[PDB]
Design a protein around this ligand. Structure first.
Ligand SMILES: OC[C@@H](O)[C@H](O)[C@@H](O)CO
Ligand SMILES: OC[C@@H](O)[C@H](O)[C@@H](O)CO
Ligand SMILES: OC[C@@H](O)[C@H](O)[C@@H](O)CO
Ligand SMILES: OC[C@@H](O)[C@H](O)[C@@H](O)CO
Ligand SMILES: [Co+2]
Ligand SMILES: [Co+2]
Ligand SMILES: [Co+2]
Ligand SMILES: [Co+2]
Ligand SMILES: [Co+2]
Ligand SMILES: [Co+2]
Ligand SMILES: [Co+2]
Ligand SMILES: [Co+2]
Lengths: 392, 392, 392, 392
C-alpha cells in the first residue's frame, strides 16, 4: 500500500532520532540531524513531524544558536511540505525535574517548569501546531509518603489553567492533550490511565480545551484493553491525539513498531478509528507513531522501522475494511446482536412507572429460556482473525 | 485494640457466607444462615452488614417466602443493633446475565436488569441503606468485535439516569457507587479502573448523586497504586464507599483479608483515610470488607478471618498515627518538602504576565544547582516502615 | 484446509464438555454425553480424546456403573477410530484436595491421592494411553508459612517415584508429563513455570520417564514467552505433551481458542513445532487443545470453537511454511545472522589456551566497529508479520 | 541492631555508585570513587564488596592504568578488612554486546565475550573471590524469528564449559552462579526464572560447579513468589549466591532497598534463610544487596539507603525468630499440620503393592469427612503478620 498526506502519519523527532542508549548501555547510533529527519520522513510518506523543545534546540542554547536552528528547521518543512501538528516540552530529562515539573515538591522547580512550557507554546504557535501534548513523566513517586497526591493534583491544575489562559489570550487556539502513563520512570506516575487523565481534565477551568493523548503501550503496561479505552475516550470526545506503538504486556515500555506487540488489539483499534459512523473515520487527528527503532539496528534499520509503522497501519486498515464489508461477518454481527445495543433499553417516553407496569420485563420474563441462547461470539471472532490473516 | 461502632466496620453477607466453591472445585463449607451471620458479625464488632438481593432471598422465592426472610432478617438487625449501610444487586450469577445486565446485547435482559435493581432499591430504602453499589461484573467482552463500547456506555448511562430519577421522585435519598474491576469474569470489563469510573459518572444527568466504590484488589489486579487512586478519588470528592481486601498483583481476584496482600500499600491507605485534613479522617463512610475466607478453612477459620480484617485495620491505624506524631518523621517531612507542594506555585494575584516577567523563574534560574539537591525520600520511607514494624 | 489424523489434534473431554459454571455464576450449558463428544470430535477431525478420571466416571460411581460407562466409551472409540493418547486424574475438585493431592499437609490425603492416580493408570493402560499428565492445581499455598516447600518437593518426588515403579513393573510403558501453572486455584502453585518443572523432573529416580506438559496460557499468566520456553523444553528433550490455548497476559486463566490470545506468539510457536530440523516437525506428540468454549455460547458455539482451534493451527502452519520458503525471508535471515549462532564459538580442537592466544579475539578486536553494524531484526520481524497477514 | 561481619552483608560497587542516569534522564549524582566506596561501606557494616570489571577499571584502560587502579583498590581492602566474595563481568553496556555476549548472533562477539570473562576470572582469583556471577542481560531477543533459542543454549553451555575447564586447570576454585531475569533490557531474556536457570545448569559438563544467583526483583517482575523459588533452589542445592532488593510487581526493574517492595515476602524470605534446620541458617553465603539509591537522592540519601538495606534484614530477622519462638505460633503450626508434610507418605518398607492392599487409603477412605476439616492457615498467617508488625 501507499501512504498519502490524507493518512496523516506523523513521527516524533525523538523516535527515528533515538540513539539507543537504554538504562543498561551506551548509544549504538549517532545523532540524527533534524533537517535530515525532515527529508527522510517526507520521503517515507509522513505528513508531519513533532518534537520536544529539547529535541530541536539543545537545552541551554543561546538565542543566536536557538534562532539559527529554528530557521533551518523551518526551511526544511518549507521545501518538503511537512507540517508540525503537535509540539511538546521536555519536563523529564534534566536533573532539576527528578521529582517532576508541575508537581515537584520544590516550588522553584514548578515556576521554572511553567516557563519552559510557555516558551515551547510560543514556538509551537509560530510553526502552526494545533496541539500541545503534556507527558508528566516525572510527576509521581517511588514512596507513598513522599507525595501528597491531592496537593499534586491542585498544582497540576493550577499550571494547566494558566497555560489555557495564556493560549486563549494570545489567540494561539491550541488544544492540550494530557498523556497518561502508569509508571516508568517514576515508581508510579500521577494520572496512570486514560480513565484517570479524562476524569482530571473534567475538573479544569476550561475543560473544552483539554483532552488526552493515550499511548498503545502505556495502557498495555497495566494489561488494559487499549481499543476499549480509546472507545471510551471517543465516547467522551476527549481523544485529541494518539500515540501508536507496540508493547508485550506489563514490562518496561518497549515502544515497538505499531502492531508488533498485541497484534489482535492493533487490528480492533484500526477498525475502531477507521470504520466510524457512516463510512468515515471515528477519529480525525494525526496517527502519530511514538516508537523506537530497536537498539540492535543501524540507520538502515531505522528507516525500515519507520516505514513498517505505516505499512502495519495500512495493511490492518485494508483488512478491517474487508471484515466489515463481508456479508458473512454482517450475518454473524446480526446473530450476535452487536447492533441491538444501540437500541435504547427504554421505549420512547417510557420511565420508571411504565417499566414497573411492564410484566414482560420481570414478572412474566423467562430468564432461564433467554439464559440458554448462545451469542455466537467465538464464530464472529474467528471471522475477524481470518480476515486479519488474509484467509477470507 | 477493640472495634467500636464508630470505626464503622461492615461486611458483606457473601464474604463470611462464601461456601468456597471456586472455578476448579466444589464448596468446602455449608451455607451460612443470615440471622446467624448478623449475630456473629455483631459479636466481632461490625457496625453494619450488606448483601446482594440473591444472598438473602434465593433467586426465584415467592413473595410469601421472600416476605418471611426479610422479617426474620430485620428482627436480627433489631436485636443486635446492626445497620445496613449499603445494598447491591446480583447481576452476574444467573445465566441470563452472561453478556451483562445493563449492557447485554439482548434488549430484554437490559429491561429485566433494571427491574431487578429497582426492586432491590425498594428493599434497601426499607432497611435504611444509604448507598446502592453497582458492580457491573458481566459488562465487557472476551472479543473486541462482540461489544460496541460506545453503545454500551450509552445504555449504562440510560439505566443509571432512570435509577436516580426513581430514587429522587420517591425521596429515597440514595447515593450510587459504581464499582470498577479490570477483568474477571469477563476478559475485559467496562470501566476498568477507579479513573474510568470517575470519568463516566461525570457524564450522567445528576452526577452529584454518583460516586465510586473502588476495591483494593481490583486496582492491584492491574498493578496500580491503590492508595494513590483513592487520593485522586478523594480529590474529586467521589469516594462514596470503599471495599477493603488483599491481593498479590495481577492474577485472579484473591479476596484476601485486608493487609494480607500488599502490606506497605495497606499502611499508606489507612494513613490517608485516617490522618485527614484537620486531625480528622479524610473519609467518613463505612470501612467495608469484601473478602473471602480461604477455601482451606472451616467455620472457625471464617470467624478468625473476619476478626483478622478488623485487627489489621486497627493495627495499621495505630502505627499510622505514631508515624505522623514522630518528631523525626516531622523532620524528614520537612527535608523532603512534602508540605511545600501545598503552597501555590504562583504568588497571589500572579498570572502568566507576572510569571513571564520573573527572570528568576527561568532566565536566571540555576537548574543545575537545584537538580543536585536530594529530596531525602528513602530516609522518609525507611522511618515509615520502621513505624509499621513497631521498630520505633 | 482440513485436518487429517496425521495432524494429531486431540481435545480433552472437559473442554467441549465445560458447562460454563465460572467463579461468579451458574452453568449456561447442560452436560455433554461422553459418547456424543467422541462422535462430534471424530466428525471435526480430532484423532484423539483425553479425560480426567472424574470427567468420564462420576466421582464415587459403584463398580458396575463405572464398568458400564467404560464399556460404552470403548465402543464409541472403536466405531469412530479415535484414540486416547493421554489420560489424567482429577486431584483438585473434591474438597479433600483443598490443600493439594500429593502434597497436602494431611498424610492420609497424600495416601488417597496416590491410590486415585494408580487406579487411573490402570484404565489408561487399558485404553492404550501413552502419557499420564499430572497437573497439581492444588499443590501450593495462599500463605508462605502454611507450606514447607522442601518437604512438599520431597513428597511430590516420593509419589512420582512410586508411580514410575508401578508402571515399569506392570509393563504399562507410560511417560509422565508434569504440567506447570503459576497460580489459580492456589495463590502460588508449586512448580510454577516450565523451567521449574524441568528442573524438578531431573531429580526423580528415573528422569528419562519424565517430561512436561506446558500450556500456552499458563506461561502467559506470568507474561513469559511461550515459544521461547517451548524451545528450551525441546533443547532438554522434555516436551512430552503440549496444551494449546489462548490468553491475554497476567489475569485469570482464560482458556481461549489457540491463536485468539497472543497471535504473534502462536505464529512463532507453530513455526517452531513444524519447521523443525531436517524438514520435519521438531515435535511429534499430540497437538492438544485444553481450552473452554466461552460462557456466552450454546452447543452450536461449542462445536464452532472446537473447529476454530484446528483452523487456527492449520492457517498458522500454512503461513509459517510460506515464510520459510521465501527467498526474501532467507536473505533477511542471512543478513540477521540467525544461523551463525549454530556454528560453535570455538574452532574445532580450540581450547582456552588457543583462545587466549588469539589476539583477534581481544587484543586486536575492534569492538567499536562491530558494535556499529545493525542486525536487521526489525525488517525480519516485518516480513514474518506480512506472511502471517497474507500480504506476501 | 548492628551489623557484624558474621551477617555477611555485601554490596556491588555499582549499587551505591549508581549515578542515576535512567532511560529517561541524566545522571543526578557524580561518580563515586571506589576507594571511598570501600571506606564508606566498611563504616556501615558490610563485610564485602563486589564489582563488574568495568565498574573498577574503565573500559579501554591501558595496562598501566588498570594495574594502578587495582593496586589502590587492594590497599583499601587491606586497610579496611573488606573481602571480595564475588566478581562479575559487564557483557551488557558496550554497543558490541547489543545482541548479547555469549549468545550474540555474531560469532566474533561470542569469542570476545569469553576473552573478556577469562580476564575477570584472573582478577577475581587474585582478589580471593569465590564466586563468578554470570548475568546474561543481553541474551535474548525482541523478535522470535531473530534468535534460535536451541542454538543459543548450545553456545551458552559451550562458553560455560570452557570457563569451568579454565578455572579447574588454573586451580582458582571458583563456583559459577547464573543470574536469571525475565526481560529488560531485551524484550525477553534467556533463562527467565530461577527454574529455567537451574534446569540449564544441570545440562553442563561439571554441574557441581554451577548454581544460580536469583534476585528478589527479577522473580517479582514475572509476579512469582520469591521465597518459594528460593525454597526450590535450596532443595536442589543450587543457591550459590543471592541478590536482595525490592520491587512492586511486573514493571521495570526498580532495584529498591530490600524490604521496600513486597514486605510480606521479604519477611518469609528472611525466615527461610535464617530459621534453617538445626536452628541454623539454611543458607550461609553472602547477603548481597543489588539495589539502587533512588534518583531523587544525593550522596547522603545514598549512604542512608545502604544502611536501610542492613536495617531491614536485621529487623526482619529479629521478627522471624520471635515468630518461630512463640508458643501460640507453635500451636498454630500444629493445627495447620505444617510438620506432618515432613513425614513420608509411605510407611518404611511400603511400596505400591502394600499401598494397593490398604483399603483405608481408598476403598474405605472417607474423603467427605477429611474434606470438611479446616487447616487454620488464616490464623497462622495473621500471627506471622502480628509478629512482623511488632504487635506481639
Ligand atoms: O513514554 C514516553 C512518552 O511516550 C513521551 O514520548 C511523550 O509522548 C512525549 O513527552
Ligand atoms: O469482585 C466481586 C465484586 O467485588 C462484588 O462483591 C461487588 O462488590 C458486589 O457485587
Ligand atoms: O488449568 C487447568 C489445567 O490446565 C488442567 O486442564 C490440566 O491440564 C489437566 O488436569
Ligand atoms: O538487573 C541487572 C543485574 O541485576 C546486574 O546488576 C547483575 O547482577 C550483575 O551483572
Ligand atoms: Co512510551
Ligand atoms: Co507517547
Ligand atoms: Co474482588
Ligand atoms: Co467489591
Ligand atoms: Co488452563
Ligand atoms: Co492444561
Ligand atoms: Co535488577
Ligand atoms: Co542482580
Amino acid at each position: 500500500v501507499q501512504a498519502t498526506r490524507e493518512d496523516k502519519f506523523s513521527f516524533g523527532l525523538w523516535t527515528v532520532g533515538w540513539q539507543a542508549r537504554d538504562a543498561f548501555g551506551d548509544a549504538t547510533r549517532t545523532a540524527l540531524d533534524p533537517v535530515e529527519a525532515v527529508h527522510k520522513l517526507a520521503e517515507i510518506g509522513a505528513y508531519g513531524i513533532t518534537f520536544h523543545d529539547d529535541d530541536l534546540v539543545p537545552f541551554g542554547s543561546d538565542a543566536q544558536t536557538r534562532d539559527g536552528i529554528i530557521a533551518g528547521f523551518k526551511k526544511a518543512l518549507d521545501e518538503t511540505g511537512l507540517i508540525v501538528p503537535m509540539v511538546t516540552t521536555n519536563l523529564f530529562t534534566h536533573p532539576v525535574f527528578k521529582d517532576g515539573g508541575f508537581t515537584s515538591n520544590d516550588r522553584s522547580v514548578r515556576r521554572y517548569a511553567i516557563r519552559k512550557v510557555l516558551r515551547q507554546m510560543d514556538l509551537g504557535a509560530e510553526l502552526g501546531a494545533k496541539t500541545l501534548v503534556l507527558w508528566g513523566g516525572r510527576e509521581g513517586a517511588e514512596y507513598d509518603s513522599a507525595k501528597d497526591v491531592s496537593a499534586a493534583l491542585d498544582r497540576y491544575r493550577e499550571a494547566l489553567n494558566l497555560l489555557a489562559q495564556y493560549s486563549e489570550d494570545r489567540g494561539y487556539g491550541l488544544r492540550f492533550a494530557i498523556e497518561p502513563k502508569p509508571n516508568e520512570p517514576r515508581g508510579d506516575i500521577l494520572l496512570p490511565t486514560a480513565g484517570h487523565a479524562i476524569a482530571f481534565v473534567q475538573e479544569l477551568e476550561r475543560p473544552e480545551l483539554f483532552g488526552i493523548n493515550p499511548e498503545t503501550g502505556h495502557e498495555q503496561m497495566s494489561n488494559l484493553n487499549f481499543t476499549q479505552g480509546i472507545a471510551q475516550a471517543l465516547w467522551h470526545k476527549k481523544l485529541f491525539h494518539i500515540d501508536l506503538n507496540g508493547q508485550h504486556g506489563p514490562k518496561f515500555d518497549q515502544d515497538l513498531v505499531f502492531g508488533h506487540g498485541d497484534l489482535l488489539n492493533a487490528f480492533s483499534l484500526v477498525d475502531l478509528l477507521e470504520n466510524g459512523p457512516d463510512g468515515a473515520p471515528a477519529y480525525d487527528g494525526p496517527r502519530h507513531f511514538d516508537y523506537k527503532p530497536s537498539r540492535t539496528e543501524d540507520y538502515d534499520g531505522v528507516w525500515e522501522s519507520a516505514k513498517a509503522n505505516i505499512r502495519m497501519y495500512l495493511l490492518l486498515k485494508e483488512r478491517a475494511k474487508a471484515f466489515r464489508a463481508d456479508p458473512e461477518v454482517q450475518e454473524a454481527l446480526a446473530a450476535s446482536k452487536v447492533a441491538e445495543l444501540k437500541t435504547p433499553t427504554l421505549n420512547p417516553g417510557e420511565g420508571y412507572a411504565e417499566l414497573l407496569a411492564d410484566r414482560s420485563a420481570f414478572e412474566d420474563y423467562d430468564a432461564d429460556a433467554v439464559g440458554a441462547k448462545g451469542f455466537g461470539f467465538v464464530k464472529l471472532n474467528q471471522l475477524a482473525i481470518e480476515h486479519l490473516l488474509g484467509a477470507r
